[model samples]
Structure formats: C-alpha cells, structure tokens
Target: AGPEIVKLKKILREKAVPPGTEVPLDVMRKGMEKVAFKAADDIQVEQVTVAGCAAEWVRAPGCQAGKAILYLHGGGYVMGSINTHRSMVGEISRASQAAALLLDYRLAPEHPFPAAVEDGVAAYRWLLDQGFKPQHLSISGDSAGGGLVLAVLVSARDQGLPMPASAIPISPWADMTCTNDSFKTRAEADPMGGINKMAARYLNGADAKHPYASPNFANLKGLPPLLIHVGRDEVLLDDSIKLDAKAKADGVKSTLEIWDDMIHVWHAFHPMLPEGKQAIVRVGEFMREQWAA
Candidate 1:
C-alpha cells in the first residue's frame, strides 16, 4: 500500500508482461531475469551442486554454521532461477540467521511437477544425510515455489523424511484450481499477469487437484509448523488463506500473515519496499521460535 511499492510495481509493469496480458513462453520464461539486483555487500554466495541440480548457498551476516534454510524460487513453475531469486535469499538468510541453499530446480513444460518436488526432497534428503538435524532446518518459497514448499514437506513426510522446524510460504499459489473467489475479487487489484495458464504449462494435462500439484487439496497432516505470508491484493490471496485453514483443520500448526495492498512475492523487492523487508525479518522471528520449540 506504500507509494514505494507502487514504484516497484511500475518497474515490474514496465519490464515484466503488462498485467492481464498473457505472452508466449519463449519470451515469458526469460522475463524475470531482465530485472537486475545486487546482493548486499556483506552477503556471500558460494556455488555448489545438489541432487544433480545447480545450486548455491546465499549466506548473510548473521548466518549460523549449523542452521539452514532450503529455499525454492518461484516462476509459475516455468521460469525463475538462482539469478532471479538469489538476492531475496540473501535477505532471508540474513534475517533468519541461517545459511540458505537456493536451488535452481528444473522448470516446467520440460521437467514438470514431480520433477521439482523430486529435486526438493532430494536436496532435503541430502541435507539430512549430511548430518544436519531436520529440526535445525526450514523450507521457504514464494508464489509457485511457495506451493512447492508445502509439496516438498508433505512429500518428505510421506517418504519418512523428518520434517523441518517450520515453513515460510509467500503469496503461495497453493490452489491450482485457480478458480477461487480472490482471483475474481482481486482481479483488478492484482498487478501480475495471468496465472491460470501456468497450471497448464506445469501440469500439462495432469490432475489439477492432485495433492502434490495443488496442495490446497493435499492432506497436510503431520507436517511441522507453518508460517505463510500473502498480499491482500494478490490474486493468490485466497490460496494462502485457505492453505492455513487446511493446515489447521488437519491438526497442523500454522500461521498466516496477510500483508495489506501488496502484490505477489513482494519480499523480493525489499530495501525499497519497507514491508517486504519487514516480512522477511518476521520470517527470522518465526524461525527462531520454531527452532527453539
């Protein structure tokens, strides 16, 4: 709602696809990479590989040696990579006071749903096998990656992988149905382009409500505590809201933070967007408490 965010939106509207316009994948896949960002001077990025996927460790000032956050980047399951998300991960790594492993998961229309989930759990499995206690770690993601946060944890639990301390999902596109009321009510308020089509690109005729594909329909029982953040003006608002409800009904611990008048994944625009930084800082508070518990 701050005027500063309007500035960020203007840049996005100017650089990204204009709101409401659906463009071709060939161009759209490379859209977010166009915007440039510089990590804070103190942040450190180290290259590494995990589960056969290219990855990096985005470490910030307060990062502890043993604790970590396994972060997934969002791009509607099609686009986005370490190049686009590394800056944001730097902020989260510093805020949470933990090392952040940012994964460049395989994109959709080629790699698809379970592919990302496979890499997600695969990296998490590697973390555990390497002697990091499950309780010392957390999973976080935004937009499609936010939904993937749930997918990874639930799938990990099903496979008997120990759950992390908590999860942080930002404006999660948890409901692949994409027919929710917020998509209608916030149609004009939302600043992003079309998203319903992303399901097609990612799902590719697979079940829309499949537990892993659309976690809004997934069984969320037995997972660790959840901390979900969403923008009130985002089209996916209801998705994050309903995800919290679903988690609570399943007897899981969950918390929802609806940031007023923000767009999807505003946390990526911090330093200019004050609320964005605050949201990331809160993730630290939540992680600190979760780790203690």
Candidate 2:
C-alpha cells in the first residue's frame, strides 16, 4: 500500500499546475474552498470562536481524558480556512485521543504579515485562558500553518505565556524567501506548492525577510519539542531541513522525518493514500508519547 501510494503521489507531482504562472486570488480561493469542502466531510469537526479567530474543534470519541491540539492549517498565509482542514484535524484528534482546534487565522494581501501571527498567538492565549495547561497542549500545522506554529511560539515566549508541550509541523514552509536550492530542483516534483510563486503572491508588498512572515530566518531557541515531516521530493523540503538544523543547534529536541517520494503535506489525503495514513499515524504516536511523558 505504501509503495502504491508513492506511485500515485508521483503521478500527482507530474500533473500539478506548473509554477511561474500567475494565480488570481479568486481562482486560488475557489480551489482551496473545493479541497476544504472535501476534507470536511471525512473528519468530524465542530466550529468554535476563540480570540477573534474562527476555529474548528475536533473531539475524540469515548475519551473522558485527552490532550489538546491547536492545529494551524496551511495555505501559503494568504489562503486556507478552517473549512478546508477540518477533516485532517478530526483525524488527528481521533488518532491522538486529543481535542484538536483548527484556527482560521487571517490571511495576507488584506491583513498582511503579523495579522496571521497575531491571530495564532491569540488562539494559543485563548486556549490557555480556557484552563488548558501547556503540558496538555500540542500545536501542529502544515506548510504556512506549520511555519506559523513556530511564529506563535515566539510570540508566546515574548509575551511571557506558557508554551505547548510539543509541535508538529508537516512540510512547513518556514522560509518565505525562497532562497533554498530545492525551490528550483524540486519544483516539478512538488505537487501542492511552489515557493517562489506562492511566496511572491502571498507576501504581496510585505517583506519576506520579516521573521514573523518567514520563520525560517528567525531564532529557534527555547521552542517546544518539534516533529517536522517533509518529503524528499518537495520543494519546501529545504525549509524543514533548515529549521530542523537550527532547532538542533539551539539544543531543542527536534525530529525531522523526511519521507521518501511523498508530496507536500501528503498526509492530508491519507484516507486515499497509504503513505499519507502512515504519516498521520506516525504523528499520532509522537503526540501520544509527548503527552504521556
């Protein structure tokens, strides 16, 4: 199943819309909406409002006791909403026996840069205010959301707030600068994302070097345990690799899982792909370990 999944993933990589062409905001929004709508049906999610951000709370069945996951969805910081990631959140919640909160942080172009970061921090603050302890909390996201998880942590640290026990950033787009070598070499191989084009459009007029926007350029010290998953064939592979190295250098407990031949955030489609399912299961195990320890 895993090997077949890899072959299908490769097909997706080959058929993805080539980067370098312009993507209109309306078209991007529609595409995201379609995918989100599909994901919602597969996962059990309930809508909630927290700290001015629209969130989807995923509850596990038959669990009187469980941890909590503050999940951030990926959409290049300009797109994506709670509707799109509800299913993935539900799956994670069920698998981890943890309640998952999927935050709908403001996107860019209208509310550039810090708006998303601020929203994420507010969501974390809201969770803490709800009496959830840092030990019982975990943060996770993919792509931009993955990167913003780190951003949220930095903000929490600066604001003197307690941090979550762990974080899982799947194929995180930590760097918006698109200066990595993979951006070029892995462009055709990465199915879902292309850094150069997406970054330019998402950044709009905002500076990519702003640490809040491009977390890869920021300091990684004192962050909670991070489990970063990246595909060897994805363009954003370097972003995860880079951040993983930085985390290690900062003496942080970090694990980098570079899957073979998987596309970006492939785990989101795990219901239809074996490798994706395995990735999510792997994440579940990691979260369980952290929560128990």
Candidate 3:
C-alpha cells in the first residue's frame, strides 16, 4: 500500500467507526452532518443540483469536460448520505476526470426497499433529460448503494429506458437476505457490517426477496457491462463474486477484481491510503475506457 492509502486507512479506521444501530433516521442524518462539518476542510468540491437530491461534484485538475458518473452511497440503505462519502466521491471525480454525482437517495426501514430504487432511477432519468448521452453516463456505488445501481439498471432494462455505458459496484450488498455464507464464515472479519445486527432496523419492514432489496437473485439478462471490485477479507466478498458469475452466466459482460486484506469500500479512504488511491485510479481507468471520446 502507498503511504497515502495507509494514512487514510488509519484515519478512517479511527474515525468512521460503525454506529451499530437502527438509530433514528434523523439522528443518523445528524451524525453524518457532524462528520461533514469536521471534514469540511478536506472537501474541496461542491454540490450541484440534479433532480431533488444534491449531487456532489469533484473536479480533477484540467478535467472540465468528460463523462458523467452517478454515484450511490452505502449506509446499509439507512445510514449514509452524500456527505458521508464526500471524500470518496471527490476522489472518483478527480481520478475519473468526470463530474461525479453522489446521489443522497432516501433510506429504508422508514422508507423501505423501493424508495431507494425509485430515487436512484429518477436520478438517472434526470441526467438523460439534461441531454447527457447514454454512452457518456456510468453508474457507480459502494456496498448497499452498489446493489442499488444494479437494481436501478434492472429497472431501466425492464422499463425500456436508456442504459448506461457501464457500471462499477464496490463490495455491493447483493444479498440482503443474509443467506450468503460470508455473512457467517467471514462475519468476524468485517468491521463495518454484520447480518441482522446493523441492518435490522433499516430492513425491519422490507421484503428481503425483492430484487430491489436483494439483487443477488435478480435476473441478470440484458444488463449493461459491470465492473465489480471486492476485498477478500470482507464478508460481502461473495456478493460480488456471485453477482459477477450470474451476470456472466446470463451473457452480460462482467469482470470482478478481488483485493486481498482490503476492508469494505477500502477505496473510500484513498485520501490517505495508498491502496485506496490505487483502487480509485483503477476505477477511473475503467470509466475512461467506457466513456473516452
């Protein structure tokens, strides 16, 4: 790992500790607000309005023109906001040379499964309505949000909407049912997530079998190309693997990359970790390959 990635990992490890609750959605929002304030100094980018949600945009040097990236944040579908993943989104914008739109979609428990998916699909439609070509658009997200990207893609496919150039899902929670073995076998290794413990309240009233909620079992045919990144040590590692295999089996172009010893969405800590930067750069390369002029 590079020195920067190491520092970022250490900082995030110390600061991004889990809330470990189905805390009041309002409280969760407040907690993220506090983190945003504390890390305000680290945020060099600003938010742009797209639809009802604010889309955070980060620019790389000399990167004023490029494709657009719709970024979905992960907080078990109940915890995170765009602020929680500000640095991560900025890094993506910088590395990808594209304006990254971090969608602060609605959460679950209070909102439930289809709410997030609805907002996600709306965000994409808004982008297209603004005249951005489908070939220059990519959808990306991490953890729960990653799963949402696929869910939204499925919706788009079924609804006959314009599809994105590609997708990048990092450590996505494809199986909300918690039926996957990693939820048990690798449970202890995951410092960020646990089955039924952290997500209980959020998923309290939702149906786990719904494709919008648990995408692992969703139909994979006719989806856009996908790039899935996972960490060998993370419990959700199997989610990425399974989704990749399913997509491939269904004849969709899909690729999976596993990084050993990396934590959940480890790339988010790239502001300080070398490995994180490397991952971000790699993702940027993939987006560029898809959207390059």
Candidate 4:
C-alpha cells in the first residue's frame, strides 16, 4: 500500500463509529459532505432536472463532447445526493475525459425500491433523448449507486432499450440479501458495520432476492461490457467478485479489479488517497478502450 493509503486507513480507523453505536442520519450525511474534497477548478458543473429527477452535468477540461457518463451516487440507497458526490464525479469525468451526468435519484424509506431504479432508467433515456447514442454512453456508480447501475442496465435490457458501451460499478452493494461472507469476515477491518440493517432501510418490504434489489440473482445475459472495481478490505468485496463471475458466466464481458488493502468506495477520496486517483485513471483507460472497441 502507498503512504497515502496507510495514512487514510489510519484516519478512517480513528474516525470510525464505534461498533453498536447509533449515529443520527442527518449527522452522517452532513459530516460526509463537509469532509469530502472540493472539485478542481478545471471541472465545470451545471444543474438541471432530467425526467423529473434533479441531476447535474460535470464536464472536465478536454472531455469528449459526444461521449458521456451517467453517474449515481452511493448512500445505501437513502442518504447521498448530487452535492455529496459532485467532486468525486468531477474526478471521474476528468480522468475518463467524458462529461458525467450525476443523477439525484429518489431515496428509500420513502421512495423505496423500483423508485430509484425507475429514476435511473429515466435518466438514461433522457440521455438518449438528448442525442447520445448507446455506444457513446456509459453508466457508473459506487456502493448502492453501483448496484443501481446494474439494476438500471437490467431494467433497460428488459425494456428493450439500447445498451451503453460499458459500465463501471465501484465497490457495488449488489447483494441486498447480505449473504456474502465479507460482511462477517471483513466486519472488524471495515469502518462500517450493520450493513444488513442499513440495507433493510432501503429494501422496505421488497424481497431481498428480487433481481432489481439484489442484482446478483438477476439474469445477466444481453448486458454490455462491465468493469467492476472493489477494495479487498471492504465488506462488499464479495458483491463485486460474485457479480463479475456471474456476468462472465452469462457471457457478458467483465473485468474485475481487486485493490489490495483498500476500503469501500476509496476512489471518492482521490488526491488525498493516491490509489484512488490511480483507480480513476485506470477506469478512464478502460472506458476509452471499450468506447474504441
């Protein structure tokens, strides 16, 4: 691990919530936004609404005008927003050299299952309506949003919509059932715990095994190429690994990168975390390769 990785792990370990402690939702939300890095000056942002969902367009210096990335922010399907993820998306946009559209999809415990998925599909369709061909566009997200990216693609395939060139899902929480062993094996090492309880908040009454809720059980045929990134130390590591295996088994082009000793959604901490920046640059190269193919 790099020095930045070691330093970040120490900082996260220091600030981690004690096991069994209960933190108010509002506090967690506000705290995350406050500590997140600011967007670089070279990136520009524009706010707009797409298909009734609030969204933003993040454009990096020298980004391709015709190609785009549709980004979904991760907050366990309930907490995060455009503001919470803007800077991270800006880094992705810059590295990938593609304008990114970050969507504020409806959250759970209110909007519930299907609501976020619906909003995701709508946003992709909105991109299509704006004249971006399927081959010129890609979808990506982290954590719950990462799972949502796959859900959106499955929904699109079922609806007979055109597929994007590729997808990138970072440390995706793809299994709502919480059956993965990482939840138990990585619990002490991971900063976050009680993920099953957290997932319940978004699942509401929906079946955890439902394809849209837990994409690990979904039919993977017909989806486009997928590039999945995960940290070896994360509780959700198995989610990405299993998803990659499933996708490949079903004939989908899949690439999985397991970053050693990293934490969940580590790419969001770029500049402060050297590995995070390197990961995004790798994502850029992967996206460019897929687009060219």
Candidate 5:
C-alpha cells in the first residue's frame, strides 16, 4: 500500500462508527452526500429522467458518440442519489470516454423487493428506446447498486431483451443471504458493519435467496461479459468471488480483480486514493475493449 492508502486506512478507522452506535437513515444519507471528493470539471452533467426515475447524464471530453454507461449508485437500496455519486460517475465517464447515466432508483422499506430491479430494467429499456443499441452500452455500479447491475442483466435476459456489451460490479453486495464466508471471517477487518441487518432492511420481507435479491444465487448462463472488482479485506469479498466463479461456470466471460489491502468501493475515493484512479482507468480500458469486440 502507498503512503496515501495507509493514511486512508487510518482515516477509515477514525471515522468508523462506534460499536453499537445507531445512526438515523437521514443522517447517514446527509453524511454520505457531504463526503469530500473532487468532481471532474471537464465532465458536463445534465439532469434527465429514465422511465419515470430521475437520472443524470455525465459526459466527458472526447466521449464517443452513441456509447453510454448506466451507473447505479450504492446505498443499501435506500439512500443514495445522483447527487451523492455524481463525482464518482464523472470520474468513470472521464476515464472511459463515454457518457454515463446515473440513476436515482426507488428505495426499499417503501418500495420494496423487485422495485429497484424493475426501475433498473426500465432505465435500460429507455436507453434502447433512445436508439442506443445493446452492444454500444454497458452497466456498472458499486455495493448494492453493483448487485442491482447483476439483477438488471438477469431481468433483461429473462425478459428477452438484448444484453449490453459488458457490465462492471464493484465490491458488489451480491449475496443478501449474508452467508458468504467473508461476512464472518472479514467482519473485523471491514469498516462497514451490520451487513445482515442492512440487507434485511432492504429486503423488506422478500426472500433473501431470491435471484433478483441475491444475484450470486441467480442463473448466470446468458448474461453479458462482466468485470468484477473487490477489495481483499472487505466483508463482501466472497460475493464478488463466488459471483465470478458462477458466471464463468455458466460460460459467461467474467473477469475478477481483487485489489490488495483495499476497502469496499475504494474507487469512489479517487484523486485522493491512487488505487481508485487506477481502477477507473482499468474499467475504461475494459469498456473500450468490449466496444471494439
């Protein structure tokens, strides 16, 4: 790890919630939005709607025409919005040279199970309606949003919709069952706490093993190519590992990158975190390769 990454781990340790501390959802959302990060000045942001869901288009200089990426923000299926994740999406758009669409999908406890999945599929269909072919598009996200990326692709496949060129899921919360070995083995090392409770809250009475809810259990036979990234120390690490294995066994093209000593969704902390920037650049290169194929 670099000096900055060492400093970052220290900062994470300092900011970690005290054991048994209970934070209100609104407070958590506000704190996430207030997190400091530099947005790309070269990227232009435009607000729009996809199938009744609020979204934003992020376009960087030299982005290729007709190539697009749909980005789903991670918030345990409840709290994140375009505003909270705009900077990260900007970074991805700039890195990939593609316009990115960030979705503000419906949340849980209010709009439970399958709602997020429906909204994700709706957004993809909207992109197609606007004339962006499946081969010219890709989908990506982190944490719960990363899980949604898989769910969306599966839903699209079941619905007989064309697959996108590729998909990227970063530190995905793919197994809502919370049965992954890392959840127990890596709990102390992971900064994020209450994994089971958080997932239950989002599930809202839905079966944890439902393929749409826990995509790690889904049939992966016909999905598009996938590039999955995870941190070696994250509690959700096994989710990505198992997901990649399943995708490969099902004959899908899957690439998994486990960054040493990194934390969950570290890509969101770019410019300040060198690894984050490197990961985004890798994603850009992967997307370009898929486009060419």
Candidate 6:
C-alpha cells in the first residue's frame, strides 16, 4: 500500500464504530454526500426516473451509444443516492467509454428488503426497454449495491430477462448472515464495523439466508461473468472471496482480485489512493474484453 493509503486508513479508523454499535443511518448518508469525490468536468449528467426510484444517466466523452452500465450505489442498503456515487459513476463512464446509469434504490429501515431488489429489476427492464442491448450492457455496484448486483441478476434471471454482458462488484456485502470468518480475523484491521447491525437494518426481520438478500448462498449458475474486487483490510473481504468461489464452483465465470492493505470500496477514494484508480482502470479493461467476448 502507498503512504496515502495508510493515512487514509488511519483517518477512516477515527470515524469508524466498532462491532454491534449502531451506525446512525442519517449521519452516514450525510457524511458520504459531504465526502463524495469529484467527477470529471467533461462528464454529462441527466436526471431520469426508473421504477419510481431517482436515477441519473452519466455519460463521458467517447462513450459508445447503446453500450452502458447500470450502477447501484453502496451504503449498506440503507443510505446512498445518486448524490453519493455520481463521481464514481462519471469516472467509470469515462474509463469504460460507456455511458453509465445510476439508480437510487429505496433504502432500508423503512423500505427494507426485496424492495431494493424490485427497484433494480424495474430499472434493468427499463434499460432494456430503451433499446440498450443486453449483450452491450453491464451491471455494477459497491458494497451493498455490489451484493445487489448479484441479487438483481438472479431475480432478472427468474423473470426471464436476458443476461447482460457482465457484472462487477467492489467490496461486495454478499452475505447478510455475516457468517464469514473475516468478521473475526479482520475485525481490528478494518476501519468500519458493525456490519451485523447494518444487516439487521436492511433485513428488518427478513430471512438473512434468502437467496436474493444474500447471494453468497445463492446458486450462481447461469449468471453472467463477474469481475469482483475486494480489499484485504475490509471485514467483508470474504464476501467477495466466497461469492467468487461459489460462482466458479457453480460453473459460472468469476474473477476475484484482493488488494493489499485496502479498506471497503477503496475504489471510491481514487484521488488519494492509487489503488482505487488502478482498480477502476482494470474495470474498464475487463469491460472491453467482456463486451467483445
């Protein structure tokens, strides 16, 4: 890791809460908005609505028409809107040379599980309805949204929606059950904690093992190829690892890259962390291959 990465981890630890502590949803939401990264000046953003959820179409120079990505912002499924992830989406748009669509799925502690899933399905269908070929489109998400990417796939699959070209998940929170051993081994090294509590808020008494809620346990056969990234220092590291293992075991094409000494969604901190930007570039390269394949 770079010196900047070390410093960023130190700063994040100061703001982090320990396991079992209640993370104030409103505060986290507002905090993320305040800390959002900057989008490139040349990016174009347009407001749209998909399935009643607030949405934005982000496009950068050189983006090819009809080829796009549907991005789900991550905030533990409780907080996060287009406002929080716009910068990341814009950057991805530029890097991939593909227009990006970001949607604000209804959050939890109110709207709860299956609701976000429903929103993503509708948004996906809306994308196809707009003439974006599934062969040219991809799905992506971070943390909570990362897991949602998988859930949306299976849901869309069962509904008979054609599969997109690929899926990318960064620091995915794939297991609501928090049964992974990373919670124990990575507890002290990670900056953020209390994911069990986060799960509780999103689940709202729903079954944690429900395939849609926790795709780590879901049968991943028939899903599109996946390029998943996770940080070594994140408590949820195993979420991506286990999901990759499951996918490969089920005969689905999956790739997992674990970065050293990084925290959750380090790709969101590109300006200061080289690894973040590096990972995004990798996403672009991977997308090109998937689109061609």
- The better candidate by TM-score, 3 or 5, is 5
Tens digit of lDDT per residue, candidate 4, span 1-293? 78987788888889878777877777877887787677888889999999898899999898988899999889998788898888889988988899999999998767888899999999999999999999999999999999999999999999989999999999999989887888888776766445766578888878998999889999989999999999988889899989999999999999999999789999988878888998999888888899999
Candidate 2: 10-residue stretch with minimal lDDT = 35-44
Over 118-180, each residue of candidate 2 has an lDDT whose tens digit, in order, gives: 998998888888888899999999988999998888878888888788999998988888889
- Per-candidate TM equals 0.96, 0.92, 0.86, 0.97, 0.97, 0.96
> lDDT of each structure?
0.87, 0.81, 0.77, 0.89, 0.89, 0.89
lDDT of 5 by residue, 132-192 (tens): 9999999999999999999999999999989999999999989888877887788777765
Looking at candidate 5, what is the lDDT of residue 154? 91
In model 2, which regions exceed 4 Å deviation? Answer: 1-3, 10-15, 37-43, 62-66, 201-204
Q: Name model 5 segments beyond 4 Å from true.
A: 36-38
Q: Write the per-residue lDDT of candidate 3 for residues 45-70, one digit (tens) a residue.
A: 67677667767665555454647888
lDDT of 6 at 151: 96
Q: Report the lDDT tens digits of candidate 1 across residue range 1-293.
A: 57898888778667664456768886766656777477888989999999999999999997778898999899999998898898888989888899899999888888877798899999999888878898899999999999999999889989999899889888888877798999889877776625767788789888999888899998999989999999987888899889999999999999998888888888888879999899999988899889988
**Model 5 per-residue lDDT at 99:** 94
- Displacement of residue 252 (Cα, Å) in model 6 is 0.4
Q: Model 3's lDDT to the true fold?
A: 0.77
Better of 3 and 4 by TM-score: 4
lDDT of 6 at 176: 93
